[PDB]
Amino acid sequence: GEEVKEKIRRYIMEDLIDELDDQTPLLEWGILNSMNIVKLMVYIRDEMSIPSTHITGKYFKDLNAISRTVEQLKA
Amino acid sequence: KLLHERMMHSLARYPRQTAVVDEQDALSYEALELRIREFVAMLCALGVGQGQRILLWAHKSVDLVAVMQAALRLGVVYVPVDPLSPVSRLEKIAGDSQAVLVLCTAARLEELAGSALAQVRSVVLDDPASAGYWRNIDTGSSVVPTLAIQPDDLAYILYTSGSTGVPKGVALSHGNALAFVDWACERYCFQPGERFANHAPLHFDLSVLDIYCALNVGATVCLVPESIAFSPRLLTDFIRQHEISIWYSVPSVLMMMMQDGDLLSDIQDTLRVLLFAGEPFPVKHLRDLRAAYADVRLANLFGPTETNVCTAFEVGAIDPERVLPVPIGTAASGNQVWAQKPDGSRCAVGEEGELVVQGPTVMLGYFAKPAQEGPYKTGDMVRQRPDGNYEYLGRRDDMLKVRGNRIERGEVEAALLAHPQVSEAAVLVVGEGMNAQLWGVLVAHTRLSLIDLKRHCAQRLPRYMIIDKVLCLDALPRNANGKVDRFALARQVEGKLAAALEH
Numbered sequence A: 001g002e003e004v005k006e007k008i009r010r011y012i013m014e015d016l017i018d019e020l021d022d023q024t025p026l027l028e029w030g031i032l033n034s035m036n037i038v039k040l041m042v043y044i045r046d047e048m049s050i051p052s053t054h055i056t057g058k059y060f061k062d063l064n065a066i067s068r069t070v071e072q073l074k075a
Numbered sequence B: 001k002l003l004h005e006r007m008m009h010s011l012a013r014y015p016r017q018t019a020v021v022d023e024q025d026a027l028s029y030e031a032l033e034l035r036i037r038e039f040v041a042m043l044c045a046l047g048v049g050q051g052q053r054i055l056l057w058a059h060k061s062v063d064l065v066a067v068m069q070a071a072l073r074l075g076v077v078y079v080p081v082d083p084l085s086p087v088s089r090l091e092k093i094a095g096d097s098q099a100v101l102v103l104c105t106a107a108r109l110e111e112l113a114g115s116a117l118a119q120v121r122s123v124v125l126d127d128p129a130s131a132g133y134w135r136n137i138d139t140g141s142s143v144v145p146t147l148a149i150q151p152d153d154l155a156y157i158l159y160t161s162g163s164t165g166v167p168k169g170v171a172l173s174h175g176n177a178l179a180f181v182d183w184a185c186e187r188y189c190f191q192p193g194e195r196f197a198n199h200a201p202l203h204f205d206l207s208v209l210d211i212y213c214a215l216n217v218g219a220t221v222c223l224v225p226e227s228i229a230f231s232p233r234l235l236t237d238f239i240r241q242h243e244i245s246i247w248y249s250v251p252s253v254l255m256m257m258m259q260d261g262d263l264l265s266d267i268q269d270t271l272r273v274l275l276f277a278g279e280p281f282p283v284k285h286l287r288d289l290r291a292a293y294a295d296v297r298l299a300n301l302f303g304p305t306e307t308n309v310c311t312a313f314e315v316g317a318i319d320p321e322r323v324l325p326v327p328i329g330t331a332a333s334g335n336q337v338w339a340q341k342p343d344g345s346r347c348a349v350g351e352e353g354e355l356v357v358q359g360p361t362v363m364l365g366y367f368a369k370p371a372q373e374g375p376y377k378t379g380d381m382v383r384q385r386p387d388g389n390y391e392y393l394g395r396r397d398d399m400l401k402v403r404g405n406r407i408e409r410g411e412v413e414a415a416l417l418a419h420p421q422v423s424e425a426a427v428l429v430v431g432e433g434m435n436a437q438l439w440g441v442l443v444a445h446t447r448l449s450l451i452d453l454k455r456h457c458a459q460r461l462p463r464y465m466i467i468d469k470v471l472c473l474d475a476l477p478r479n480a481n482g483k484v485d486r487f488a489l490a491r492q493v494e495g496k497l498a499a500a501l502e503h
Ligand SMILES: *P(=O)(=O)O[C]C([C])([C])[C]([O])C(=O)[N][C][C]C(=O)[N][C][C]S[C]([C]S(=O)(=O)[N][C][C]1O[C](N2[C]=NC3=C([N])N=[C]N=C32)[C]([O])[C]1[O])[C]1[C][C][C][N]1
Pocket: A032, A033, A034, A035, B160, B200, B201, B204, B205, B206, B229, B249, B250, B252, B253, B276, B277, B278, B279, B280, B281, B300, B301, B302, B303, B304, B305, B306, B308, B309, B328, B378, B380, B392, B395, B401, B402, B403, B404, B405, B406, B464
């Protein structure tokens, strides 16, 4: 949960782009966008598999929203 | 003849066909006609007259298409404003257009409340609960003015990136619109009952083919919703679910759909016409699309907002050894087009020059600015091959293209400069195409976090003009004349990155 959330926050901050808060709006401020969102999914599958119905504001709004998404993908 | 009359012709022949579809709702020509008539009563009750400006600030909807068509009939000038763009930029467009009405959603009322256009009338399109809901406006004691409208009258203004940070209004007429629509309708043989995807937002002129060509031939336009913009598989699902025959986007979108949305594995049998515009199409990828969709009509349409489509090339078979993008082709929309040397003379076959457009699509002019007089110089460098087709070579000015979006360096720079801890700013693009990134090179007052700056940009600019990367310098390279050395600046940003791939 808080570990899932930090492996992501590390990746966003390192491999895509300070402090990046849980609620920092990733799409509103173009931190996540058409070109980098599919990369972050390469990673969340290849090293933690998000579906394409999910590539939208609901799933990827906040850092904690991307947290819930992977958490809820159990089986 | 006129734009609003093409819907009325379609209504008479096809009142029961579906005219306009969005994510939530759809309207027949008849139901569209009654919605239009109700918006006409509303504009009249509100006192909005011929030539006055209204701002459309809401996600694409069947109500927006109805409002556009209501404004046309009253010769009220409608201004589509990017709904993914902040209130501070609407204030600039509101200032420039001097518009007297905003049509928004109930969610947007709060932004307007604190803004500079707080005192401009708003009406809510979506939420019946909202005191500003459009049906709450009493139209009983109101009558439709007696007036006529000529082909050369201002129909709508499409705002574009301004070098000074105030966006520029491309003021366009019935005749501007219709010369494109009639040209496309004849060229791609658009039929009643055909289904047009509207990918582009309403403030771009791709949307004018999708909506006005559809309503011209008694076909259906499907508003691709904002919510599925970053989802290549939802975009190919939209094609399947709405049985789309006619697709028109920047190549960046078709390429997302080819890489991450199965457009080449899961063939969309309904597609008949695939139109792309706004930036080059890497010929290696366009060769793939051509192969998958052997039967479909493919065309490369070219031009700025100021001319709509002024040139077009039918993509048949593509030489496998070809490395350059396909030509932008020959004149379109009943325009004449030529390459100019900087002295004034026509270029000859093989001579690079600036593309010039004379014809019926050439804008009236930037709104509240001196009219366009004579042929229009595009700023686009081109070169004619023997066969008569033009190839696009690039631009020599401060108009950037990132994945089809049009960005003035100065608009982003003016935003960055307004940051309290930024004294100098310069913007540029590193990379080509899908790889391209928008850079801010800044000097701080007292030495600027990327996240802080993105927050700062997002309050003033559309997200597509928010800078990807920042580079802080102690000062910006200058030229002898005092102006920023953009060539030096580019070399130094390219150089710092090259040092990071070596280290
Ligand atoms: P992400 O990276 O978070 O999102 C990516 C994605 C989904 C692509 C997103 O960026 C998006 O949705 N983009 C939408 C882009 C779009 O729809 N733009 C409309 C193009 S409007 C263009 C007129 S203009 O004034 O904006 N630009 C004119 C300018 O462009 C160049 N140009 C035009 N046509 C071409 C062609 N065929 N080849 C090369 N260059 C071209 C010229 O320099 C011109 O001056 C349209 C295009 C036809 C009519 N107007």
